[PDB]
Design a binder for these strands. Sequence first.
RNA 1: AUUCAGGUGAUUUGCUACCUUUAAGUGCAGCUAGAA
Length: 162
Amino acid sequence: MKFYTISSKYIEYLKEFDDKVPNSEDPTYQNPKAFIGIVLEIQGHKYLAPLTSPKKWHNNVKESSLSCFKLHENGVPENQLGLINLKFMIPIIEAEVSLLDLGNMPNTPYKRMLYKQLQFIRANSDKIASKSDTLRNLVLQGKMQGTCNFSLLEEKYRDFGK
RNA sequence: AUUCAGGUGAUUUGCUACCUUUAAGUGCAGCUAGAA
């Protein structure tokens, strides 16, 4: 798994079908909204899932929740690092997506945080792929709401631009 | 941005574990000190 960004035009396109697809453009954003890399690959679809910085309501989400994978520094549980917002993962196409360039990124606190996350994610990368698969299944069966319409997105995301 | 999926313990507060391939109750607190 790796960090990605997603072209604004592609986010805009999907937003047309499901208004829950994560926002890309925002003036509060210091860095681009970062997505986490191939969280689930099934039936030809590859999903990326948006990372999100900590909010107040995060304390209430259970570790067992299918909607989020809470992130923290390896072996320092009190160093919370936001969460992978699985409920808003989206299918992608290689063309409209590009890896963060960690190689050439100047050393900033942000880059340092990126690496604390990368390690925790890599370490728990089976759990994360397993939550995703289950979350998708429940949504497709109608048992869960509040998420991206996977069934719909999976039907339209390959058209673009026609 | 998008402000908590449902379920598993002859019992179960909180968190955690577990299971959603129709399967699943572990751990630490909590309360407890009962009698074959």
